[PDB]
Amino acid sequence: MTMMDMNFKYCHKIMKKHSKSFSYAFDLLPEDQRKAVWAIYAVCRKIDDSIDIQFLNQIKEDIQSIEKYPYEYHHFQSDRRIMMALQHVAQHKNIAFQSFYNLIDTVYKDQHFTMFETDAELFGYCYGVAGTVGEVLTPILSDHETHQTYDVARRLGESLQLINILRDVGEDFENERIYFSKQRLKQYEVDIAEVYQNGVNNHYIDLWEYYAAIAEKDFRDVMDQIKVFSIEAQPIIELAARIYIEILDEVRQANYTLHERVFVEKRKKAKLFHEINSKY
Numbered sequence: 001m002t003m004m005d006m007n008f009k010y011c012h013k014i015m016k017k018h019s020k021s022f023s024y025a026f027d028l029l030p031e032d033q034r035k036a037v038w039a040i041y042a043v044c045r046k047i048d049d050s051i052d053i054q055f056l057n058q059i060k061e062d063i064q065s066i067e068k069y070p071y072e073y074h075h076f077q078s079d080r081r082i083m084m085a086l087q088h089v090a091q092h093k094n095i096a097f098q099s100f101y102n103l104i105d106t107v108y109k110d111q112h113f114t115m116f117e118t119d120a121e122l123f124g125y126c127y128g129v130a131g132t133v134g135e136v137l138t139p140i141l142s143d144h145e146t147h148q149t150y151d152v153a154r155r156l157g158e159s160l161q162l163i164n165i166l167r168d169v170g171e172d173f174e175n176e177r178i179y180f181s182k183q184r185l186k187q188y189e190v191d192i193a194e195v196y197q198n199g200v201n202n203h204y205i206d207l208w209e210y211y212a213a214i215a216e217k218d219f220r221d222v223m224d225q226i227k228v229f230s231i232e233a234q235p236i237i238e239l240a241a242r243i244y245i246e247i248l249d250e251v252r253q254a255n256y257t258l259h260e261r262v263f264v265e266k267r268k269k270a271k272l273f274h275e276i277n278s279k280y
């Protein structure tokens with residue numbers, strides 16, 4: 001195990017600790033591509049957590065060091081192991097650094113969190129925080145990147161974020177956050193705090209299912225265009241997607257509770273993989 005291998009293994013650990021789903025799916029990639037993914041993930045994770053600001057500027061500065069001096073040795077201010085891995089990746093693939101900066105800008109913003117007036121700002125947030133992740137991963141998951149590849153990855157990520165939001169309504173409220181748009185909360189006649197006190201009702205379902213139908217529709221457009229990705233990645237991406245979709249059912253299964261996080265059992269993930277793995 002070379003030093004660089006240790007670095008990637010740190011990145012691996014960060015990823016299976018914090019997101020079982022993507023980990024389960026992406027680890028199935030060929031050695032070289034999964035390592036790149038581990039590394040992009042860990043950099044993203046670390047951006048997400050820089051909250052609990054000084055450390056976020058340090059991450060941004062490290063990323064810029066790499067962008068403009070890929071082959072020079074840096075003394076990273078943030079996480080050496082993560083940045084060493086990221087720099088190794090960038091030496092071999094065309095990383096969209098602007099997407100990292102988009103992601104970071106979006107995270108700065110969260111500490112001024114103001115509810116979204118309209119779905120459009122909700123969608124722009126889904127871009128900044130997840131669509132950007134899709135863009136960064138594109139060169140890993142396809143041989144010849146075209147605007148179409150980026151577009152599909154962008155849409156997949158935004159759709160996954162949306163599911164994430166659909167799943168964490170409860171937890172998110174507690175942390176003083178709501179991602180449903182004022183526009184759409186007025187329209188559907190819905191007060192989060194109220195439902196978080198008195199359980200669900202027909203108006204909440206409707207609002208929730210309204211957003212769910214959106215995620216689900218982006219999902220299919222993505223599956224329809226799965227072909228933009230490399231052959232080895234298509235089944236993995238689809239598996240990753242199908243798992244996050246299945247979380248939609250889980251939430252209905254638990255009658256949309258806002259007091260517990262639902263999840264897809266590892267065993268069910270393998271079932272989906274088989275379903276998918278069968279015809280590939």
Ligand SMILES: CC(C)=CCC/C(C)=C/CNCCN[C@H]1[C@@H]2C[C@H]3C[C@@H](C2)C[C@@H]1C3
Pocket residue numbers: 022047048049107110129130131133134137153156157158160161164
């Ligand atoms: C794998 C592909 C194509 C996309 C994955 C994209 C997915 C689902 C990202 C999860 N996105 C969380 C980003 N972090 C956000 C940031 C604002 C706020 C506070 C922090 C910082 C934690 C959360 C909520």
